């Protein structure tokens, strides 16, 4: 009936926007990855730009630049800009 | 008649009524309490329905036991080393038995795990202050003659017979 909006479609529209989002992680919901994705592949192993670790409890942000986070330790993201 | 590990391994070790591991040996009149630990740590209930066991004795080291049927037996007394061989024991149902005098209640109190007990149909039943002796000697008990124990009964049973 209704057609599929792929998660790769989400990531592709985000990258085309070159937008800044914060992403969730595994077994630790305290930390978020705040940055923009540069490109992609068929694998959804998230590559990132100007990213930083942002802690909930600690309240700090440690920046990496164009970082390549793991693909399996992704959960989702919120587009903040 | 020889009661062997034949009749203990061929015994039924499977889901009981309250969904526990029970091992029935009904229909033997087995008077010999031997060769039992070959339940192999996968059993909690040992049942000897239709037995003539000269008294209450003869079990192996079962740190797991959770029910035992020694009813319709020839229980006259009560043996000593019951607790270290049944620390997980709450159900030692010895009704239709032939315990007589409160000297058959000497090892009854040394267990810390007794709550669900039955010694029904014994001449220790209609004797005066018999349930009083029971409610004195059994601290952690909760199921006695299939009706709850009472704090009033415990007060009576501690206070009397000083």
């Amino acid at each position: 009936q209704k057609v599929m909006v792929q998660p790769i479609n989400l990531i592709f529209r985000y990258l085309q926007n070159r937008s800044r989002i914060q992403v969730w992680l595994y077994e630790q919901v305290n930390m978020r990855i705040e940055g923009c994705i540069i490109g992609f592949d068929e694998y959804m192993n998230l590559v990132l730009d100007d990213a930083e670790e942002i802690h909930s409890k600690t309240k700090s942000r440690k920046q990496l630049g164009r970082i390549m986070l793991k693909g399996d330790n992704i959960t989702l993201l919120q587009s903040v800009s | 008649v020889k009661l062997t590990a034949e009749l203990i391994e061929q015994a039924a070790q499977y889901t009981n009524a309250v969904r526990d591991r029970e091992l029935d040996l009904r229909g033997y009149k087995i008077p010999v309490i031997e060769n039992l630990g070959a339940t192999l740590d996968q059993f909690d209930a040992i049942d000897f329905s239709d037995n003539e066991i000269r008294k209450l004795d003869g079990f192996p080291l079962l740190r797991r036991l959770k029910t035992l049927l020694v009813n319709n037996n020839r229980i006259c007394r009560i043996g000593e080393g019951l607790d270290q061989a049944l620390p997980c024991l709450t159900e030692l149902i010895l009704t239709n038995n032939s315990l007589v005098e409160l000297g058959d209640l000497d090892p009854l109190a040394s267990l810390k795990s007794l709550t669900y007990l039955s010694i029904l149909r014994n001449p220790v039943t209609n004797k005066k202050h018999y349930r009083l002796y029971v409610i004195y000697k059994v601290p952690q008990v909760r199921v006695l003659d299939f009706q709850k124990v009472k704090l009033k009964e415990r007060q009576e049973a501690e206070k009397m017979f000083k």
Partner: protein, 167 residues
């Protein structure tokens, strides 16, 4: 009669699992424990059934525990009207059944007459209605179940009683 025995008339402030443990301890003696069908919903509260190995076992737990004290009120046990799902998936020798139904099913009549050590056969007098003659391959069995059936209920609209056939 039934191997599924009704056990009820106890308290409700008692738990289903706890009363099940009590019933197991007090039922492995008079019969075998196959399964305790216990429902504590309101439509059937304070009651359960134990499915014993033998129908005479269940009715004998009923006739010995005919009001045995337990759990807030002397519990009453009888046979059931039918049998449980486990067992569902599984003085003389001859005696005239008076108040013998012109309606009874010969199957249930046979399970009644063979409650005892196996009966020989039941012969529901097919002339002038309301009579039967049943013989048992064990005369002690016949007399036992016929005396315990003096005034027995089957299809409770009547009492089906069997006495020693005359000379």
């Amino acid at each position: 009669p039934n191997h599924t025995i009704y056990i009820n008339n106890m308290n409700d402030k008692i738990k289903k699992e706890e009363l099940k443990r009590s019933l197991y301890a007090l039922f492995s003696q008079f019969g075998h424990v196959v399964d305790i069908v216990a429902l504590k919903t309101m439509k059937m509260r304070g009651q359960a059934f134990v499915i014993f190995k033998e129908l005479g076992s269940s009715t004998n737990a009923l006739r010995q525990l005919q009001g045995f004290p337990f759990y807030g009120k002397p519990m009453r046990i009888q046979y059931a009207k039918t049998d449980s799902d486990i067992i569902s998936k599984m003085p003389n020798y001859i005696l005239f059944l008076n108040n013998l139904p012109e309606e009874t099913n010969e199957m249930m009549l046979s399970m009644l007459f063979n409650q005892f050590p196996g009966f020989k056969e039941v012969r529901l007098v097919p002339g002038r209605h309301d009579i039967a003659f049943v013989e048992f391959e064990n005369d002690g069995q016949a007399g036992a179940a016929r005396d315990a059936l003096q005034g027995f209920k089957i299809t409770p609209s009547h009492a089906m009683k069997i006495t020693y056939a005359k000379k």
